[PDB]
Amino acid sequence: RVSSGRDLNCVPEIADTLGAVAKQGFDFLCMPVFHPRFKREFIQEPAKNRPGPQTRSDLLLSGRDWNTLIVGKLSPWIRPDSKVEKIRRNSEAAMLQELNFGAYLGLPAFLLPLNQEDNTNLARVLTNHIHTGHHSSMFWMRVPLVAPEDLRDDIIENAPTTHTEEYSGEEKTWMWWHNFRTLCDYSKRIAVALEIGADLPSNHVIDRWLGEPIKAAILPTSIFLTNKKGFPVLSKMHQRLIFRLLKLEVQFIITGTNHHSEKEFCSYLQYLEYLSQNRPPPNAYELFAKGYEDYLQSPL
Amino acid sequence: PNAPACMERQLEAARYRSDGALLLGASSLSGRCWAGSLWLFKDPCAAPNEGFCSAGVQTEAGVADLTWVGERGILVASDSGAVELWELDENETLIVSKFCKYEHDDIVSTVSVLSSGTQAVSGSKDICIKVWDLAQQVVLSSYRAHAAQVTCVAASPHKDSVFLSCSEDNRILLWDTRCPKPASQIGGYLPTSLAWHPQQSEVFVFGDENGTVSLVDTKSVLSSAVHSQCVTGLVFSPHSVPFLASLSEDCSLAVLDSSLSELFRSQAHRDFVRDATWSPLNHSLLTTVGWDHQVVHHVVP
Amino acid sequence: QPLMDNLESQTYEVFEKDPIKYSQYQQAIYKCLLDRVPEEEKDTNVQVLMVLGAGRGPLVNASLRAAKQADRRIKLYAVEKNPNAVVTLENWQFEEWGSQVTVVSSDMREWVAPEKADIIVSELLGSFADNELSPECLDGAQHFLKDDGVSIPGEYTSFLAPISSSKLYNEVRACREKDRDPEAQFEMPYVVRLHNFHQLSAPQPCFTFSHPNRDPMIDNNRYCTLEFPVEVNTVLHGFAGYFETVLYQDITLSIRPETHSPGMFSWFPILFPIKQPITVREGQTICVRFWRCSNSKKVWYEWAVTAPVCSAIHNPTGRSYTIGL
Amino acid sequence: QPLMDNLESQTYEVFEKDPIKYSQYQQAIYKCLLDRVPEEEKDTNVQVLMVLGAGRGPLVNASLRAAKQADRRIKLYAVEKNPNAVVTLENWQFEEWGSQVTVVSSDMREWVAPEKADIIVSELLGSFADNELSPECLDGAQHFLKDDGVSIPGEYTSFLAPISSSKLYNEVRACREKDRDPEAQFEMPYVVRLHNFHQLSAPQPCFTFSHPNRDPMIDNNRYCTLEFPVEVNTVLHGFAGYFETVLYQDITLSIRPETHSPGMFSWFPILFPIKQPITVREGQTICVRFWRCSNSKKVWYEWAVTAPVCSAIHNPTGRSYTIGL
Numbered sequence A: 001r002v003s004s005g006r007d008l009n010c011v012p013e014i015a016d017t018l019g020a021v022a023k024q025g026f027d028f029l030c031m032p033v034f035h036p037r038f039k040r041e042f043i044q045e046p047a048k049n050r051p052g053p054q055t056r057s058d059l060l061l062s063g064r065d066w067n068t069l070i071v072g073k074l075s076p077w078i079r080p081d082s083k084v085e086k087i088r089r090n091s092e093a094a095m096l097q098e099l100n101f102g103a104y105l106g107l108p109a110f111l112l113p114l115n116q117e118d119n120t121n122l123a124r125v126l127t128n129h130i131h132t133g134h135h136s137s138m139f140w141m142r143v144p145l146v147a148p149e150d151l152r153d154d155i156i157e158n159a160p161t162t163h164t165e166e167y168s169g170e171e172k173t174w175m176w177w178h179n180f181r182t183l184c185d186y187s188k189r190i191a192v193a194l195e196i197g198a199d200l201p202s203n204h205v206i207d208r209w210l211g212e213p214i215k216a217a218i219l220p221t222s223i224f225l226t227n228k229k230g231f232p233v234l235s236k237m238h239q240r241l242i243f244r245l246l247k248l249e250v251q252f253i254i255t256g257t258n259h260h261s262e263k264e265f266c267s268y269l270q271y272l273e274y275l276s277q278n279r280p281p282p283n284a285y286e287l288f289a290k291g292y293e294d295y296l297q298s299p300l
Numbered sequence B: 001p002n003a004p005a006c007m008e009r010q011l012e013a014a015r016y017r018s019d020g021a022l023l024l025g026a027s028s029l030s031g032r033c034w035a036g037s038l039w040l041f042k043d044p045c046a047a048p049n050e051g052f053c054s055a056g057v058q059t060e061a062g063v064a065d066l067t068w069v070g071e072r073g074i075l076v077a078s079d080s081g082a083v084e085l086w087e088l089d090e091n092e093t094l095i096v097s098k099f100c101k102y103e104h105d106d107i108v109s110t111v112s113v114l115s116s117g118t119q120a121v122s123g124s125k126d127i128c129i130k131v132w133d134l135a136q137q138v139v140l141s142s143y144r145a146h147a148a149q150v151t152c153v154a155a156s157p158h159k160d161s162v163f164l165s166c167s168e169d170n171r172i173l174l175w176d177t178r179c180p181k182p183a184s185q186i187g188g189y190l191p192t193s194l195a196w197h198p199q200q201s202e203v204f205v206f207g208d209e210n211g212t213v214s215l216v217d218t219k220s221v222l223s224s225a226v227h228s229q230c231v232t233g234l235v236f237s238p239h240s241v242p243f244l245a246s247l248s249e250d251c252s253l254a255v256l257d258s259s260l261s262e263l264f265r266s267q268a269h270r271d272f273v274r275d276a277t278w279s280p281l282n283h284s285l286l287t288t289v290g291w292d293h294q295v296v297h298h299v300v301p
Numbered sequence C, D: 001q002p003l004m005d006n007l008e009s010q011t012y013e014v015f016e017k018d019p020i021k022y023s024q025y026q027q028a029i030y031k032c033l034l035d036r037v038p039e040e041e042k043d044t045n046v047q048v049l050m051v052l053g054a055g056r057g058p059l060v061n062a063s064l065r066a067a068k069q070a071d072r073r074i075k076l077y078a079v080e081k082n083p084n085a086v087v088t089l090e091n092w093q094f095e096e097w098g099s100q101v102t103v104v105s106s107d108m109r110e111w112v113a114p115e116k117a118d119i120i121v122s123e124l125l126g127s128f129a130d131n132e133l134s135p136e137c138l139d140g141a142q143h144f145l146k147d148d149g150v151s152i153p154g155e156y157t158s159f160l161a162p163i164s165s166s167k168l169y170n171e172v173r174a175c176r177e178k179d180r181d182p183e184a185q186f187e188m189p190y191v192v193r194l195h196n197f198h199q200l201s202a203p204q205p206c207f208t209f210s211h212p213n214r215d216p217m218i219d220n221n222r223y224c225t226l227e228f229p230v231e232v233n234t235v236l237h238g239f240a241g242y243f244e245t246v247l248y249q250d251i252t253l254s255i256r257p258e259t260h261s262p263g264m265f266s267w268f269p270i271l272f273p274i275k276q277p278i279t280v281r282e283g284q285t286i287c288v289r290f291w292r293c294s295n296s297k298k299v300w301y302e303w304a305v306t307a308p309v310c311s312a313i314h315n316p317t318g319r320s321y322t323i324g325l
């Protein structure tokens, strides 16, 4: 059985949203804790003095539900590495605010994107939240296998996509991650949420992630092919990647809208259960070793 | 009048129709419920008072942007990932949903009707730009030209294959769908707003995240530090020689001339200025909406 | 440490789950409104009530229930410095309370109040009464209380008792951490539901604070000597700490075992350990000294046993434990 | 840390033993008095001078020598928070200075000044310019400066340079102490007369402060990225820190090696170490990030190398080193 989550960026009513998601068979919901478009000002009047509540109430869910069913998401307007000083400062204050609300809610995990090369100040703000107060939330860094710049359609007449091999360049998002966790001092609380695209990179790029703390794999509905009966399926190569991820016992995250509209949403989940049930059974050694994976012991 | 009992605090959009009726779009960006609403005021002075609207309707999610589709249609950019078409009933007393298509994988941020008025273009946080056939209610083409969130899309006033896009990947793209490679890169600080010049076919203006407004010619740049923060919108006046309204997150409104020089300034808004619309009846009257729930009617000198 | 730290949602949920406590504050507010506003003035006289450290709103609701039962007019201010709790209060204000309640997102020591208060209501008390810094907070809020203004609580007192417990002594011993002084675990108090222990002498009052604080050039620092008669042979491992508070007149709350408020579980006793166990013979007196110290940044306790034998002074200068201001 | 700590008599004696420094401040005051008071007003116009952090009195004497040479009338206030230095100033005031000098025993951020100043004179600068908290102190004193008032110094800037030194790296390594994080010695700056080292790239400006601070809602926090071109093969062990200050107009003080004030020894360079040495090939760029952080109690620096390889962020949240406010 797979542990799965639903990634949503639009949650009109939490209780209605969680219920719908859980009926579909998901174990958790990744959602914004402040409205993703609700940009807040911290320095300049009059906007810094904006009234009313800044977000929805913690009273909307039981404490058990916040602790178990909700993965917080950082607002997409928060840019701590912006080239604009005012944007950097508002982002720092907004990032601390969102992280602190997450810690207030007792969220098991919180998603932060690694979507560019320089994340120095995002790492400084996270490292500072980690050393402030008493909390133990996991931080899941959302990082793509292939950078959006490297998978764009070759449709810009005067800015063509490079057809030549860039061995180290195709591994760039691993370096985004490596630099981020080096800055943060290998904190046990910082993990990878690996995002999977329609076109898989070459093997060496995938193998770069071997030995990395992958806690989740993000599967967009758009990467799924359609079978004879209209159900979402994966290419033999994506299936190969899923089998490796299931061995690591990652939590799967389904992102985007239903692109298999004629069929129900849980079909994406059903396909993952199918792959999970259709993997090789554990041999005598594998059944014995269960629970000992990466568990350090003193030699007898 | 069959409309919701109360409209949401965060006014996102304001657009006058050729007769002078005012279209409003709102979202609740805080509190328990994060939904939205579409409103029509045949009496714009009554706005935003719900008990004095001509028609009003509640949407499932927030209104990130909207546009008129002729005189009766209302195209909506939804937080849900949907692009929705709504239409005023034959009595203009009810806003009825025509289509709700979930084609985008994240918030639909920007929406624009092409010159023919038969097709539209959407932009999203999912990094894609889509071309819609409004009568068939389908996506004709989907484009992943960008490497980050699509901030703004603006259809050419007069060319049905031409549009602009700008994004957090620092690209401004000029599109011509007749081309095998439809996008072309034009050309700093991130581009946040776009407006084609109403008279000069090859001229457009763009706003940036640092408060700068720029004048750009395709065939061939003029620039001014208009705002202290992000330029949210740019709307040219309906005059023979247009005036240019700029709105920002600095909570101000500036009305500029052909040389980008400031003629008018308003600090009426207590929160972010979201949309501006020039009156089709009184060319000196400009209406702005903001997150402070104010509908301000400005008299421009 | 609700002043230094922002309390989590589930911590506030625990506080709120104590009905006895809130019915006591409601009773104290009810009595105070009746003594401040005569029947003839009930429609004219609006009392300005200020909840200082409102949390998620139980004291705001207790004040509103109190005004309804007293049939007196109130104007409420809900002051909270934790912006995460402010979200809860602001959602309550829009949905339930309305204009009657003004939510203020601020530290009570910094807040420029628009008008003076008739009553200030707070629950800034710890297990040792003043260990959460209620004296410093309420001294900072005092200038916005009217000359005839009332503070609920009006008074609080801490109590100490010598205890024997080789079980708890070992529990403190096991709190040795790396990158700190190897004995720092003994120089800090612990909140603990004391179970396997022996109370060696009856609890005696340690420190008292009164609000409003009348005396000019106020000093929250203190030095107390306590002499505990011991009737048994034993081993001293530390001091159990409790408190009592006067909300208003005869309405009180207590965690002192002999006067414990029935059914109230908001506070467990505190434990001030000692580094070395001390032998006590029957008929001997245990003499303990406690200091409440501070600077502009921190508050802390220092303590020592001076009879039957001396201990070292524990936590000198807050080197192992401080309470953030 | 002269703000947090009271400097000893012999520490002040060391400062005073630098004639170049005081003749520079005297020259800056002399020039300022001549620009502020025209010849015709020399008998009518008395300038209110305030020495903020007067120590044992060298800036008071430099101000008096400056007024005598400019032939302008001055009214001096000598502000000092260290009461041990106040004894020296008060003995000087009774014996030498007289009524002309008013000694004030107070923190400049708390002092209720009886009148506004024409000129505020201070020497609150450390080896990294702002590391002794001159920005916070002078921001707190600003309200008592006249609208056209002058601050001496008027500006200061810190500089950084990558350095190689296996000798200093080992010296930091040997600073491991018990009862603290085993790597805390690498997350704190040191004042050091750097001798056996290699400067890897020319010093570049890091942080700048201007006084009076004109901008509303002042922020002393900062984030700087510096790119250092490297022409040699080497090993990076840390960053040498220096400063420059504009006392008045063209009158300056500098410890930046290329512009060093001749004969001035009041400040040695600062050293920001890194935990792990970093290999640098010729032609590579060293990229360093520095933050100046704070809360209401403390100020600190955080730093990291992001090229040719990443280091961990050093001193996150001031966990190893803070500057007391």
Ligand SMILES: CSC[C@H]1O[C@@H](n2cnc3c(N)ncnc32)[C@H](O)[C@@H]1O
Pocket: C002, C003, C006, C007, C015, C052, C053, C054, C055, C056, C079, C080, C081, C082, C085, C106, C107, C108, C109, C123, C124, C137
């Ligand atoms: C019910 S526990 C005490 C409550 O008072 C709040 N609090 C403590 N000290 C202050 C203060 N100085 N100003 C405002 N609220 C305070 C805390 O954040 C908490 O919600």
Ligand SMILES: CSC[C@H]1O[C@@H](n2cnc3c(N)ncnc32)[C@H](O)[C@@H]1O
Pocket: D002, D003, D006, D007, D015, D052, D053, D054, D055, D056, D079, D080, D081, D082, D085, D106, D107, D108, D109, D123, D124, D137
């Ligand atoms: C010459 S070193 C700096 C001098 O200024 C003093 N000082 C530093 N900060 C302050 C302050 N905030 N108020 C008054 N004196 C200060 C120190 O005690 C020292 O004598």
